[PDB]
Ligand binder design. Sequence first.
Ligand SMILES: Cc1[nH]c(-c2cccc(N)c2)c2c1C(=O)CCCC2
Length: 129
Amino acid sequence: SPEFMNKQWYLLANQLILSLSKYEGGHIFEKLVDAKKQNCPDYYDVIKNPMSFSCIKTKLKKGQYAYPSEFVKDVQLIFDNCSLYNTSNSVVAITGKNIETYFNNQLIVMGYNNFILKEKKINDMLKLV
Ligand SMILES: Cc1[nH]c(-c2cccc(N)c2)c2c1C(=O)CCCC2
């Protein structure tokens, strides 16, 4: 059931974004960076597509993800901004790498990746039909 499936992976995404918020070090990605208060004034000169857990929660609450991959793309964007801005040996970069690993392993345990595969196959059915 295509609508039933949409409900399923929305529930998985909500559970996963919550697990990230509570994983060790998750708080530094919960909200968009306040550049002046965190002593990083150049942050938005470098990061032109900012993203945080709270942004993703808002898009989930508003039904703004159409496909399972779009949620993963937004979470991955957090980790890419983290590794771009912070040097590889910094606490923040290490923390971001650790949470990234967790997220990708949750995609496996929760079976979220199966929904991304079904999303691609449906897109191929439609392209034939
Ligand atoms: C995504 C990110 N979060 C936080 C942060 C936020 C709240 C408290 C603390 N302690 C750190 C940072 C960050 C960066 O990569 C840019 C450098 C600033 C640090």
